[PDB]
Amino acid sequence: ESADLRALAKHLYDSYIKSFPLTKAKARAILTGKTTDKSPFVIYDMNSLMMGEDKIKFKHITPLQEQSKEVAIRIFQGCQFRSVEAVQEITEYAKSIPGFVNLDLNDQVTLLKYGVHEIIYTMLASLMNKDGVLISEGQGFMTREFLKSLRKPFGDFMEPKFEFAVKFNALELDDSDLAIFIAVIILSGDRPGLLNVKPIEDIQDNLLQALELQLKLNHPESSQLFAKLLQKMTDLRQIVTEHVQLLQVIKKTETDMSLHPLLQEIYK
Amino acid sequence: ESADLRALAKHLYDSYIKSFPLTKAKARAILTGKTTDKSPFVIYDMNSLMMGEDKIKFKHITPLQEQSKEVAIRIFQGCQFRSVEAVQEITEYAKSIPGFVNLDLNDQVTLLKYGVHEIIYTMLASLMNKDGVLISEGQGFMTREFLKSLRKPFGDFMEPKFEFAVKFNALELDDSDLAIFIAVIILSGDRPGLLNVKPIEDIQDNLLQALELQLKLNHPESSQLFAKLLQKMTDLRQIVTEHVQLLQVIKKTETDMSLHPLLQEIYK
Ligand SMILES: CC(C)c1ccccc1-c1ccc(O[C@@H](Cc2ccccc2)C(=O)O)cc1
Ligand SMILES: CC(C)c1ccccc1-c1ccc(O[C@@H](Cc2ccccc2)C(=O)O)cc1
């Protein structure tokens, strides 16, 4: 029924708005949009990075570049920390999806284990425009100019993500659309190791329905936005395959040091 | 208008019939050992494939191979020639898709460059069952076991296709459906290096409507076949990656080994 697919959509939207502090409405207001009530700290230069890292609410290392660790790393590692933070919020949102918690525990884990990268990159697109990405709960902005330039085993990692964000974003989805889309991704059915696919796909089926109606109602004048959004899943899949691909190579830089035991742990 | 959408489906389907000698229907008929108006010769081992040269049109060698272009080589040289036929056939089909020949001459070649293989492996599924694949116009059937048991490299070329086929064939799509879906795969847009794009998204936006209605009509007792089908698109993407990189390998160990110019120009 329609009335149901309309309920699920509001429920999901509510949980989402809760599980996630910075919404895409808020990220856009801050971004290109005006809504200038407290402009962010822009990081465009190598010196600009130092200059704000000592007053921009970040928890890890302080501005100390000169024979004391590097910057190309300090930046890539930070993405991994915040993302781990983001993972907790996603795990919470998941439990808010009808039927999710009723699934076998082993499968709740597996779904989360393989769906997070996709969820992360989808949301990160909310914080990105063609010129840059909002950093630290939006208290900052790291230019696409700087990032795209950093050293060698990194500037190759970012850029392609910006390519995906502009395309994805060209879809002009909002948090109401995305809350369901994120639910669909989670409730897949083809993740390796699932033990009981039936219930999972049963749920995704309703979510796909809710998403379809959502896009129809929310983007009436938008031809095949449903189909268009679904085929973006490959973009994500590729971006996530490419992410590990370079998440491995990094295992040929900062490595053998006996000071990262409990830290390398907290971030697998 | 849906009456105009059923018209586009007839059209694509007629051209599909006219461009591909071996439809899924002909293939299923042959595969189900049921209809034996003409069954296949089964290649499951060295002797099978050996005695097979005399049972079907195998211009290839029959006698010794290990020192005169081994079997693993003859089996993949032929696969190469079937690839050049498919491209020729698929190219013929593309000219029949409304708007395609109008597009910028350059892009026509690009949509083909990329799209030619995703469609190949889609259709190659019509010729497979969890046990093997039809060859030489259905005259023969090669085991999924025999293939995998070839040399170190080659022996894993096919296993990934079989994997996809079993799950793809699970959708129970038919020739009329594939026709519309095959068109979509070509009129993509998110294709790397396309001068004009919008002109393409307007075409694919229409096909998508054609497919959407075609699935609801053709498969009523189903839910989200449309969505499940589109999601299957990434499955093809992945296959492409692995194939090309695995193709890169044989190109070095086998210096004398070539690669048809049509196909070589396609690869990047
Ligand atoms: C098997 C590889 C190593 C090979 C060796 C020598 C000559 C040709 C090939 C070859 C490899 C892959 C291959 O797949 C086709 C695509 C294809 C595969 C199966 C059926 C139809 C089309 C392609 O690369 O264009 C075709 C030929
Ligand atoms: C099935 C494709 C993906 C493939 C991948 C890797 C290696 C081989 C193949 C392959 C593709 C087409 C193919 O069809 C040939 C098989 C064949 C082989 C020897 C002699 C006649 C036909 C055909 O129909 O002509 C055989 C193998």
Q: With beta carbons less than 8 A apart as the criterion, state whether B111 and B185 touch.
A: no
- Angle between helix axes A2-19 and A71-95 (nearest 10 degrees) is 140
In the sheet that A132-135 helps form, which strands lie side by side, from edge to edge? A41-43, A140-143, A132-135, A128-129
Beta bridge partners of B141: B42, B134
Q: With beta carbons less than 8 A apart as the criterion, state whether B173 and B123 touch.
A: no
Probe site for chain B from A213, A214, A228, A232 (most B CB atoms < 10 A): A228
Which architecture does CATH list for A1-268? Answer: Orthogonal Bundle (1.10)
Which amino acid is it at A220? P
Which amino acid is it at A243? H
Q: State the sign of the Cα–Cα–Cα–Cα dihedral B197, B203, B206, B207.
A: negative
What whole-number distance in Å separates Cα of residue B221 and Cα of residue B178?
18
Is the Cβ pair A208, B190 closer than 8 Å? no
Probe site for chain A from B231, B236, B238, B239 (most A CB atoms < 10 A): B231
For the record, the structure tokens of A36 come out as 């200038």
Beta bridge partners of A133: A128, A142
Which of B69, B75, B116, B246 to mutate to test ligand 2, by most ligand atoms within 8 A of the CB atom?
Answer: B75
What whole-number distance in Å separates Cα of residue B146 and Cα of residue B132?
9
Report CA(B80)–ligand 1 centroid distance (Å): 4
Is the Cβ pair B237, A234 closer than 8 Å? yes
Smallest CA–CA distance from B222 into chain A, residue: A205
Count of residues in chain B: 268
CA of B153, closest atom in ligand 1:
3
Any CB–CB contact under 8 A between B224 and chain A?
yes
Min Cα distance A231 → chain B (Å) is 6
Min Cα distance A222 → chain B (Å) is 10
Q: With beta carbons less than 8 A apart as the criterion, state whether A47 and A60 touch.
A: no
Buried b (16+ CB within 10 A) or exposed e, A219-239: beeeebbbbbbbbbbbbbbbb
Which A residues, 127 through 186, put their C-beta within 8 Å of a C-beta on chain B?
Answer: 167
Contacts of B28 (CB under 8 A, 6+ apart): B126
Does residue B144's CB lie within 6 angstroms of at least one atom of ligand 2?
no
Instruction: Measure Cα distances from A97 to A174, B96, B172 in Å.
Output: 19, 45, 30
| 3-class DSSP state of A10 | helix
Q: With beta carbons less than 8 A apart as the criterion, state whether B134 and B40 touch.
A: yes
Q: Which of B167, B212, B234 sits opposite A234 (nearest CB)?
A: B234
Contacts of A199 (CB under 8 A, 6+ apart): A99, A102, A103
Beta bridge partners of B140: B41, B135
Q: With beta carbons less than 8 A apart as the criterion, state whether A21 and A15 touch.
A: no
What whole-number distance in Å separates Cα of residue B101 and Cα of residue A204?
38
Strand B41-43 to B140-143 pairing: parallel
Q: Is B34 exposed, middle or buried (0-12, 13-18, 19+ CB in 10 A)?
A: exposed
- Chain Cα centroid distance, residue B175: 13
Does residue B146's CB lie within 6 angstroms of at least one atom of ligand 2?
no
Give, as one character, the DSSP assignment of residue B35.
-
Min Cα distance B47 → chain A (Å) is 37
Q: Where are the beta strands (DSSP E) in B62-126?
A: none
Q: With beta carbons less than 8 A apart as the criterion, state whether A179 and A12 touch.
A: yes
What whole-number distance in Å separates Cα of residue A213 and Cα of residue A226?
9
Beta bridge partners of A42: A141
What whole-number distance in Å separates Cα of residue A165 and Cα of residue A171?
10
Any CB–CB contact under 8 A between A233 and chain B?
yes
Is the Cβ pair B208, A230 closer than 8 Å? no
Q: Which residues of A touch B209 (CB under 8 A)?
A: 223-224
| 3-class DSSP state of B42 | strand
What whole-number distance in Å separates Cα of residue B123 and Cα of residue B179?
10
What whole-number distance in Å separates Cα of residue A116 and Cα of residue A191?
12
What whole-number distance in Å separates Cα of residue A251 and Cα of residue A261?
15
Q: Which of A167, A227, A237 sits opposite B230 (nearest CB)?
A: A227
Residue with tokens 């002909």: B26
Q: With beta carbons less than 8 A apart as the criterion, state whether B79 and B133 touch.
A: no
Probe site for chain B from A188, A237, A242, A245 (most B CB atoms < 10 A): A237
Q: Which structural technique was applied?
A: X-ray
CA dihedral B205, B209, B212, B215 (to 10 degrees): -120
